[PDB]
Ligand binder design. Structure first.
Ligand SMILES: Cc1cc(=O)n(C2CCNCC2)nc1-c1ccccc1
Length: 119
């Protein structure tokens, strides 16, 4: 286990670009990490954005978030894909939250950002 609740990370999921997140406990499993049905470790994350979104993400697609400028180093992991405006706008909002979260303590981030789940 490389990440704990409140850690800031980048997550790469499906068709989405590397996205700023906060590791969090799954609202049902009450764990932030697990071994999946293929035998691989995953982490539970909240994506930073205007709309609350969460996912279980494979450990190979989770990276420590040190700052927004790391994005260039992640793409590298010339021909470049364009940045679709609608997604770019949502990603910019997410990054603004992650940049504010970076200035907080782990306890502050947990208090400030942990989602509330309603049945
Ligand atoms: C980055 C990302 C990956 C990703 O897998 N999902 C899923 C999560 C479950 N619900 C469907 C969408 N949403 C996002 C996302 C995009 C923009 C704003 C916020 C989050």
């Amino acid at each position: 286990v490389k990440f704990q609740v409140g850690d800031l990370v980048w997550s790469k999921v499906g068709t989405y670009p590397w996205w700023p997140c906060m590791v969090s406990s799954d609202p049902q499993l009450e764990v932030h990490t697990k071994i999946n049905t293929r035998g691989a470790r995953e982490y539970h994350v909240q994506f930073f954005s205007n709309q609350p979104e969460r996912a279980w993400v494979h450990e190979k697609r989770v990276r420590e978030y040190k700052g927004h400028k790391q994005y260039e180093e992640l793409l590298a992991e010339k021909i470049r894909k364009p940045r679709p405006q609608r997604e770019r706008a949502q990603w910019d909002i997410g990054i603004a939250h992650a940049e504010k979260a970076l200035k907080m303590t782990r306890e502050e981030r947990i208090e400030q950002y942990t989602f509330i789940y309603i049945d």
